[PDB]
Design a protein around this ligand. Sequence first.
Ligand code: NA
Length: 352
Amino acid sequence: HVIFKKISRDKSVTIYLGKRDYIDHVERVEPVDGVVLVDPELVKGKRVYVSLTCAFRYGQEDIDVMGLSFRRDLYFSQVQVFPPVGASGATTRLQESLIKKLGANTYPFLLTFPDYLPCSVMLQPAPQDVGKSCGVDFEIKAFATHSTDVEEDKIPKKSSVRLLIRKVQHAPRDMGPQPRAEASWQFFMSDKPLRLAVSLSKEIYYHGEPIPVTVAVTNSTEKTVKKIKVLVEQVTNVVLYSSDYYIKTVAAEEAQEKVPPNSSLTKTLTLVPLLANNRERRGIALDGKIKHEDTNLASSTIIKEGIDKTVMGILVSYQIKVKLTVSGLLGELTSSEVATEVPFRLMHPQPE
Ligand code: NA
């Protein structure tokens, strides 16, 4: 946790934070504790506020590309820090240490997050996608405002600062039951079954953690299972403004083995879904800008019970897909494919 600051152009307002990323671990969300350092001469007669905004945005970003824009503020909170209102509550150690360092013109703020928000997520469409760029952004802003006898609500940019922050998904205390699937198929002209059972070791994996997929194929058919392929697919549903759908392979492995007619195979394949696995980063839900080094695949959405899921803006989910390629018998023109899917969740580790 490295302390950073930003100073307004006129030097009247400086905001300090202790970190950029705020952990959501379901049970609670870390609040944004910081301070504002004012220049008392330059804020005389003015009020200084600090706000936290969570916004869903939709629309081409490029400021030289004509196109609609949409924004919904999913959350907003604001406090007056100057003049002091006298209702600030207890300081954190961070705030205490900054107030000591910076002196009497330093004022604390604490802006909490509610329980009904998504985490940081954004997407940029690939060429064959029809939807537009969209995301969920979090901003802290400090600014001075005043009125003159000729103009009300003045908010000069030079007396304002903003810092972009993230809300990042870490694992809760518990997780769901072991992921399992079972499917069977009977093909045209034969009642002989092909059976596929799939299990994952557990229901939550962490970013970077290998995912062991255990596949059991029971092939009573006359056909050969020529290929066993296992994918991690990311599924993204945009649920405000435009109903956009994305599904993208973010890891893949193929077994060496085939399954001949009238035979069985159990195999475990291990996959690791990582943004680093593909050069193409468009059409994928990320937790940050394509460029940045701190950018990862977006964590699974975790919706609060009873919430209208549309308020999340963008829903991100993950699944394992197991695809079996099945040989054609004499007379058939092509091989065939069958598949089944197994959901799991992907996020950062439990908090320490
Ligand atoms: Na949540």
